[PDB]
Description:
The structure is cut from a larger assembly and holds seven protein chains of seven kinds. Chain A is mainly beta and 45 residues long. Chain A is built from no helices and four strands. Chain A has a single domain (1-45), classed as Single Sheet (Rubrerythrin, domain 2). Chain A has a three-stranded antiparallel beta sheet with strand order 2-1-3, with no helix packed on it. Chain D has 113 residues and is an alpha+beta fold. Chain D has one domain (1-113): RNA polymerase, RBP11-like subunit (Gyrase A, domain 2). Chain D is built from two helices and four strands, in the order E-E-H-E-E-H. The longest helix of chain E has 5 residues, at 8-12. The chains are: A mainly beta (45), B mainly beta (49), C alpha+beta (263), D alpha+beta (113), E mainly beta (137), F mainly beta (47), G mainly alpha (66). Chains in contact: A-C, A-E, A-F, A-G, B-D, B-E, C-D, C-E, C-F, C-G, D-F, E-F, E-G. At the C-E interface, helix 2 of C face helix 1 of E. Strand 3 of chain A pairs antiparallel with strand 9 (101-111) of chain E. The structure holds zinc ion (3 copies). Residues 82, 84, 88, 90-91 of chain C line the site of one zinc ion. The structure holds one RNA strand of 16 nucleotides.
Amino acid sequence: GVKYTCGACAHNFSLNKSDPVRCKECGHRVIYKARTKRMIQFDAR
Amino acid sequence: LMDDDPVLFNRQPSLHKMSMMAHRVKVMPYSTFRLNLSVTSPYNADFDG
Amino acid sequence: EPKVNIINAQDDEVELMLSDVNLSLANSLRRTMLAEVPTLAIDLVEIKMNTSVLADEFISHRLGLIPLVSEDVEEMKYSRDCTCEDYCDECSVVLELSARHEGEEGTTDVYSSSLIKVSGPGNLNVGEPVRRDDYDQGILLCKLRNHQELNIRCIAKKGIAKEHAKWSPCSAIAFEYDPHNKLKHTDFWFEVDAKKEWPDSKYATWEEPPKPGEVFDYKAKPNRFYMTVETTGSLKANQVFSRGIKTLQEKLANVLFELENSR
Amino acid sequence: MNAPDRFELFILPDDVPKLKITPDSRVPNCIIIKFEREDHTLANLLREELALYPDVTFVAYKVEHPLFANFVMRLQTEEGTRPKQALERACASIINKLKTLDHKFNEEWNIKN
Amino acid sequence: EDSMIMNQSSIDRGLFRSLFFRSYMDQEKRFGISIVEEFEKPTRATTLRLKHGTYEKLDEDGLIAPGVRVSGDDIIIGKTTPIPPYHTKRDASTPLRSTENGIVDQVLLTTNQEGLKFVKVRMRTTKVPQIGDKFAS
Amino acid sequence: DPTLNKTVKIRQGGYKGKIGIVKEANGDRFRVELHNPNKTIPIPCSF
Amino acid sequence: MIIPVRCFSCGKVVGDKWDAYLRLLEEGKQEGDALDELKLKRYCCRRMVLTHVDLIEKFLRYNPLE
RNA sequence: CCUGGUGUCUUGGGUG
Ligand SMILES: [Zn+2]
Ligand SMILES: [Zn+2]
Ligand SMILES: [Zn+2]
């Protein structure tokens, strides 16, 4: 559903909010949202 | 608000009556208030912040 | 009646003497070359991935400053004047960049030479990032360490320096006249003796000193203007001087047109 | 947030004329020319050229505020000449001098090539 | 009177330009044995007294994603609180400060000492020198 | 109106090629929150 | 943070001369002479290279967050 | 299919 990233081992996985907030690989309890699907534009000024 | 509307202009602390004088608006780009330089003295204003 | 005598010349700077013109014309030529000679420059950066330590618009900001070959830019249209739907081949150049570091050690330096032209108004020689030699990696953009990737798509557009300084073809323009101050346009500051305390112009030997008796010629005008036009490589030095004159002509021509049409 | 678009210095709005001539009826034979979307670059060039003509009695310009790319020029000529015509003459002279100047640079450039 | 003229071309090439970062923190609060706030994208049909801004930048987890530009009063963290005694909840969401804009840079998701969910959203923008900004030797 | 809050690209004018989001669509004149500078512009629907 | 692409004051490109400057310092040249060899004659351009502080080498040491 | 509410009391650090 929503892509996340493990703050320790960088494994990527998803969670459908009701799951506990941890990394499946190492059990780290600090995680980060992956970037949006949308394209980002900047004017280079 | 449009050109030549009168507005009351004021800098604290208002120590005497020329701390509040009426000026005519001129709408301009950029985000500062502009004063003709000869009115800095009665307001005891300067442009250091 | 205007005369030119080129003192030195090379690819990216021309030093020259300009004479038998008015001061105002020499100055307007100086301003036009800095401000109104068109060039090509990146103006839109589509970041599909940036996991480097630099912020997205920080990298994008550096991209805008990379000088691009702008030789054939006169046949190219401004984006704001093109009849097409979104961009196309007639009003933009598309560039692409992709770098990555594999290995757990060392640093991958991303250089301007990795900018790959993908499309463009063929077969016009425009859009390649300028290089000094062939083994010159060019301008440092970013640095990458293990697993960090940078994959961007850049849109380059025609523009002028009035809008943003990245479109300027010049750098400095050295400019001086009357090295011995015969016209008395300046009044020198001194402690003891004005002549000993002020250094000589680098063109002091190109004109003759005022004679010790000589009276002041109140009719003399400025008449010889020495200037050096350095460029960034986005345009060759001879092109900048030529197109400066050309651009200034159309502007005066446009004024002349409007008077004969307003009646 | 209140910075104007930088492209507004040279792009003319559709309802705004590049050039506007009005009379100054207070004195004979005097016009006010308002130039839109232009600079000292153009203005100083025209001004000096005009001042060396014998039939121009007054020429001046001012850029009223640097945050707005316009300027206004005042031009008065003696009774014989019409100011607007004199302006055309000043324009054509400078176009010619720059054409000559461009030619002489090209010639000198090939010799150093 | 102590102002100064700055070269606009120098600003264009990057002089005195700076990054600016702001972080917003929020967490779920406990009101009873099984009465907890909940991070979600609140549906207009089930939640009363919604904010006036747009909710369309939130993902399904109740959190906005990095890379999306935000402007003032946009909701970036959706959270509801139930109303005691359907159509039972009340909005408790956090909008971006009205005077600001920029790009969402990074979103931290974790739990606090009490075990409830805990988020931080850092926003970055770039401040370019302009008329009125202050400088000193 | 069915196009509010949907992503948009501009195909004519000085802002041609830029991404944005429809902030307000009262009638004929849209309000696009441009991505590229921190400004929301008034723009006609033909664009 | 990283070497600027252009000199702020005059615009001459200096972002391609940073690597060349560090190498010249290993060979024992003095700072003034190294700048001279690179043809950075105006002192506006010289400040850019002489006074830049390369912090990006420090930021890269922080083990990537993906 | 119009209306449309988000806190306080302090303390501390700052600006002229
Ligand atoms: Zn893990
Ligand atoms: Zn086109
Ligand atoms: Zn310099």
